[model samples]
Target: QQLMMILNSASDQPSENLISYFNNCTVNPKESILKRVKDIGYIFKEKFAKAVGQGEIGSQRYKLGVRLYYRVMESMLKSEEERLSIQNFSKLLNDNIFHMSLLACALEVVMATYSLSFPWILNVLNLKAFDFYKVIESFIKAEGNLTREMIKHLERCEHRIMESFAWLSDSPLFDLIKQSHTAADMYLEPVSTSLSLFYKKVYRLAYLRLNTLCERLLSEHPELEHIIWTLFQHTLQNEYELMRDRHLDQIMMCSMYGICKVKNIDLKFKIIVTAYKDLPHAVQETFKRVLIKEEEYDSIIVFYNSVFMQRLKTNILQYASTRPPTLAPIP
Candidate 1:
């Protein structure tokens, strides 16, 4: 009843009404509620533009606009699937560079007013247009917990979104972030450099094999490249020593097997071996050195069951679940 009243009242004065409604909004808002919020944002576009244009940021209209901005950010932070509504809401304010910069300062206001965890805040409000890292640094110095691990994660998150690896064109990790999906997942793992680079070398070879030679597989499961990369990455991260000495070809094949099992793709070992062998590149011997003979298929099956399967079971399904028992001392 309260939310309904607040939402209906938002039409008359969105600046005031909407911010109050947003504060009352559920952390995981339903689609319809989000659409109403989007509609309100769209409805008041001109008012927001005029307030921002005149640089009356201290004005009630502008402050409320800032309130709208950060509240939407908080919602997006809480719910991953419903971010599209917030994204569309952001579109209403995306008309000018001034709008973007205004929201950046708006974020500063929320940072000061609230006592939310820095890592939690930084993880979600990663707007690409503004200097996101600079804001985090400045906020830490003024006040807020700033541990070395948090700083490392902040740097890694920045690198993950900013750096474009041309060498990984059409490759898995690149495809993972390059898509329309949010880039936050990459920051979650903060993979080591040596381990990260090593996956690319193997995955590049696998991509070559799967993308072209396995035309039927590529046609059917266009996302197989990403799945394979994920399986390999997850497996390697968890069981580095166990998998380090294994033949690269076998590891790749086992990873493919693991994903196919999880994704329920009816993959035939015959197809994988045949397609992998038909490499277009002259460096075929690099992978060919360790061929998957009839006897070795069992070994791949074993690795998938014993190694890769174990990692898949460790997947964290909860949204921003629990943090460590003890946080870094807030000195």
Candidate 2:
């Protein structure tokens, strides 16, 4: 009786402590969570602002930052999966987080760099800007030793983006712009060559990945299939033109419009406007300027004026002949 009484008393004495401990584990750190989130936002804003000032957004710096962000988020999500041991939760978190980050980074890039708005920047730099094939290669290079399935998925994305581009090239808007025969001839070869190089590198991988993802999604959620298809299609179709025209602001707006119309997701423009309200204010005023309203290629004209055309014309007039007299080299 003495032993039994001692055991019963010991058990009853601190049941509250165990319950409290569990409660703390479940719901504590309210202030800490808020503080951490705020700190992250503040740090991101500061870095982003500095990057904008340094013209880092137009350079490789923005890509490095995005890569870092993706890795960090991926690590966190993977850690959460390991801790929870829940497959579905892990998959959902990974997909959603990855997509959200992609969307955010894309938007941030657009907001930060006007040069990115112009496809000509890529042409001028001899780089493949917004080429999905290059995007996958860069992604894989950063990711380092992805699984075969993941590689396949990357290939699918490349194919989808390419197909979309091809469709856009056939569109009325593209045809309208293509009327500039000289400009078209000058630009098309370089652009096509860059795109072709990208395709050779990763087209098959992206095609496989995209198809698999679509299949999986459609099987799981048929209703969302149309929405997903529309979003992907519209984005792929309009992106090149948007960049080509240097219509960064309207590109985002129109992309949202296209998605919302297809998916029945009613996100008001005001929301997007508010999100980017500080962007224009934060950067150079010229970076915020839009070139879409002009009837012809005014941006290209301005660029030529600043770079080569003015000097070339001046030289021609000074010489007064297509073939001026050859002058002796100065000693």
Candidate number achieving the greatest lDDT relative to the actual structure? 1
Model 1 worst lDDT run, 10 consecutive residues: 322-331
How displaced is residue 275 in candidate 2, in Å? Answer: 4.6
Question: Please, what are the lDDT tens digits per residue for candidate 2 over residues 31-88?
Answer: 4333433444444455555545653333333333344334433433333344443443
Pull out the clashing pairs in model 1: none
Q: Estimate each model's TM-score.
A: 0.29, 0.23
Looking at model 2, how many pairs of residues clash?
Answer: 11
Top-scoring candidate (TM-score): 1
Candidate 1 lDDT by residue in tens digits, 52-72: 475433334333434444443
